[PDB]
Amino acid sequence: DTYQTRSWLFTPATRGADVAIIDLEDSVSQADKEQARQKAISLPLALRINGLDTRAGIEDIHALLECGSLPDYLVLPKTESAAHLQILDRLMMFADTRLIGIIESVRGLNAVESIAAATPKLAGLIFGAADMAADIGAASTWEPLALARARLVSACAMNGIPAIDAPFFDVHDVSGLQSETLRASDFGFSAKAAIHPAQISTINTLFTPTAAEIR
Amino acid sequence: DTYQTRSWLFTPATRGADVAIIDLEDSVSQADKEQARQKAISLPLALRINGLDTRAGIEDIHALLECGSLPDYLVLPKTESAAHLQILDRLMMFADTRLIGIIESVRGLNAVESIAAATPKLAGLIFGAADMAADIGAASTWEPLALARARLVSACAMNGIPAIDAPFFDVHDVSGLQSETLRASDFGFSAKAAIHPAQISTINTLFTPTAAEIR
Amino acid sequence: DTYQTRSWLFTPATRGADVAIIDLEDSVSQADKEQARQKAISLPLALRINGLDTRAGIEDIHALLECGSLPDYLVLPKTESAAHLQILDRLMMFADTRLIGIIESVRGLNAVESIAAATPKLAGLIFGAADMAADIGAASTWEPLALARARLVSACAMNGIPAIDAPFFDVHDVSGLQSETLRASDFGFSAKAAIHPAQISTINTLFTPTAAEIR
Q1: Which ranges carry the HpcH/HpaI aldolase/citrate lyase domain (chains A, B, C) (predicted)?
Q2: Which residues of A fall in the annotated binding site?
């Protein structure tokens, strides 16, 4: 069940989080796509493939469908429409695998309601702050992205799926990590991505209900 | 005129605000619905009936249409579509009664534009912060709900009706009540609901222009 | 290229910014519209005509189409639909002139996605904070308008055009001007309007890239 997860940790395919995400995309160079790919083909496991509109992502999907083996969660970058998810859904249906979409673009953000409602196999949406800000021409800070975040959480809640917050960049700014994570929880995010295991415990704790609440 | 009104005070049907709202809903227990109903049936007056999608609300509406007597304002909880308001409007076509809708759900919020335009009898919308927060999975604090609030004020303003802010929970935090009320006024709320008479003078004062402003 | 511009200065027809806007509208009295009109008919130049839904604006357009001469930028107030811009576009297809729409109303804001996509001739959108706040019944301050600004910037970014921030009212509050300009920049605005030449250097400087960026 996707709602229980609190921490999603990105580690590149080349080489305690609640979910590990094997990454084929932005951490992986263009030259490394085939090597990271087949490595990955070899506790719930996620795989972020390259975008459907990339040759890398077509290759990734082809390899997945051939060598048989699939993660519990397929993470699709630059999810921009419900058709993005429905294509994956139909593709994965031949050969129990659930989808996670990333909302990292304006186009994606404008269609977020229909994206969140696209298919039962969708298990959550990740906010992509850095690309969202870059697409808009904004700073990565909270305030310019606050609209986007609130709109994302609402679409998730409307469809009974968790909103997963963007990763926090500064591994060294534990204060900043604590503040942003708390802000996301108050907004209604159920989880937050991460790019370093040092962030995990902070993230786990803050997205964990209190004994008072559990009662 | 609804725009002049500043304070809306909820008092349960069982038993100086500009409008009093006799409540059949959340303050009244389920066992108490019949008592409160007929007692309520017994300066402008509002009645909040139970939701249209509840057996309680059907009975309330049945009793209203039967025993003849109607308030100046009919307050509908959990307004989620234009049809909600139009059904009441047609039901009220036999037997001068105006409607107030409550936006307390994501579904309501997403349809807020069409709701604000639903019928001429609609005289205003109340924000239901606590249920909205719960529906989203967010905290009741200002920030997670600012989008929801801004979207509500805008749809109201477009249809020439006042936006009425949620009641403030903490009766003891007068500071918090002043701050939120001022925030709501700045946003374009023209009025605010209340759950205790101690809040009334504060709400009235803060929504009353100053001699400085009038000059 | 509109993206290069940082400062847009409104000056009434009656009487170093990157673009000067000769203004026929709110700075010009109604008695002065004919007067102001014909002077203007006699470094890139912008012209804000009166609204299409005003007798003044029809006359302004008539005068423009007759005496042959057109500004580099035609600035249209109260842009409320895609048709607003398309009408102007077709009117000036005979006699290189690009359009700038002003989003200053709730109706304009709700249609901002379709306005920003209306025609290739559209080169940017200006936020009209003072009319937007008044239309909503809100204060002119940042917070009540933050949702509106984020929605405007998003629509611009999606269509490959710059968002231009509203002018800051207080000429004497240089601190407020600096703060608003930075917030706008962070939000993803590429430029900001001005209503007095004293504001120009501040706006220019703050929208000028640092050596770190340039590298």
Answers
A1: 6-197
A2: 48, 104, 131
